[PDB]
């Protein structure tokens, strides 16, 4: 979003990222490898799922006929009753539209926050020998092709796999 646009995050996307919405790319001699992060994708899906349940919880009163107002005899009253139903429908609809708007607003905007969190996951795995650029990228001393990138996405990557120093857990 606006964060990524200002921060210089890549505005494009990766067609090869098919197993998830969010993840990592690797650029080196191998060309460009792409891996989806399932943890980030699941978290996003769960948030949306909870949001769906929340929107589905709304209860409003039924609109039925007046028991006392008779057709023809009370048509003036019945016209007002019609107006009451119509305005209720109008008002609650716009309230629901507002609730859904804010939900989608939250969902779309949260994208860059996933990227910022994925940065933190990446950084710790890469170890203190990696250099943080700021645009969502890190420079590594080692090569990282698709086999490497997959271990990163899975959270199994260790910097010791190139005899590089690690942050101890």
């Amino acid at each position: 979003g606006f964060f990524g646009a200002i921060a210089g995050f890549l505005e494009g996307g990766w067609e090869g990222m098919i197993a998830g919405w969010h993840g990592y790319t690797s650029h080196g001699a191998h060309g460009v490898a792409v891996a989806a992060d399932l943890k980030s994708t699941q978290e996003a899906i769960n948030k949306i799922t909870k949001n769906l349940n929340s929107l589905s919880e709304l209860e409003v009163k039924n609109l039925q006929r007046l028991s006392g107002a008779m057709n023809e005899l009370h048509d003036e009253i019945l016209e007002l009753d019609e107006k009451v139903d119509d305005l209720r429908a109008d008002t609650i609809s716009s309230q629901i539209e507002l609730a859904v708007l804010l939900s989608n607003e939250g969902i779309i905007n949260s994208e860059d926050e996933h990227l910022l969190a994925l940065e933190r996951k990446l950084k710790k795995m890469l170890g203190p020998s990696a250099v943080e650029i700021g645009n969502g990228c890190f420079e590594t001393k080692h090569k990282c092709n698709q086999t490497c990138l997959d271990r990163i996405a899975a959270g199994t990557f260790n910097a010791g796999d190139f005899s590089l120093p690690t942050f101890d857990s």
């Binding site: 996307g13 990592y24 790319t25 650029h27 039924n62 008779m70 609650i92 779309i108 990227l115």
Partner: protein
Amino acid sequence: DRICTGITSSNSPHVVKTATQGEVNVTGVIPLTTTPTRSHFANLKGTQTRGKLCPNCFNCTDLDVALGRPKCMGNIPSAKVSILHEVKPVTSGCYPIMHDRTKIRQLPNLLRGYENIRLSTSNVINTETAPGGPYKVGTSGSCPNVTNGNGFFNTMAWVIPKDNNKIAINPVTVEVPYICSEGEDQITVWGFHSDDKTQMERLYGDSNPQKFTSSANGVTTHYVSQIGGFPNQTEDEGLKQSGRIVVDYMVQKPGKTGTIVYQRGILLPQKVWCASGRSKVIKGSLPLIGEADCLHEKYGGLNKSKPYYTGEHAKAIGNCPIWVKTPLKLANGTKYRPPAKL
């Protein structure tokens, strides 16, 4: 090497609105609405649903029952939910009524607005002590009773002056007592008979127009009868008659009396309706087929899937989806991204 964070790129045909980015394409959505299709009406799940007032009263319309037509008495189940299937209820028997000269047609629709509906066991007025000289109660071939003898609407008494009483009278007043149980509304049915000049004198000893006045809850209604030249019998038993009756109802709130000022041809109230509670009413049609989460005036019976619906808003009762102006979607994916220049 350089390792970066990234977002997917996929087919994004779906559109949602945002506050700060306008409309955006997304890879996936969860639809929150459907447009229902019209279906038959049905029983409301978890609630016995009233259609006809007396379901087991065959060949009897709701208005027949409400007027207390002979052979049209029966069990009237209580119901918290009711279907209005007759916007202008009709009769299908008994003595010919000039319906549209009063509000009487809507009487059964008024009744179905109550949860509990029952006919009184006692008469609200004693014909043998009613003002206006001595009377006999009249019967007719158009109203055969339960032992197939000549009768009349059980809600009323067609009183005809005795041979020593065939004379015109000043308008006399009767007070209609509240005889229903605690919290019940009393709905009192009454009216007046009229005929051509010859029959009027034979029956009543007066062939001038007769006048009738009711008063209840601050509401006064005034009628003047017609002597001959009637519209033809309709919605009746089919037996030719020279006379017509006019019928009205009078609502009496708990502990409230009503009055009727009358002359010749009066149909004194007898059995009255006692009603309590409220039934939830919507327009619909019969028969009720099957069961549904929700009854909807436009779509009939429908079950609830999506939390919202689009289409024709109308009165609806039960477990219903909430109406919205537009087919709302919940975003379930990411904002569209063009493929990155690799």
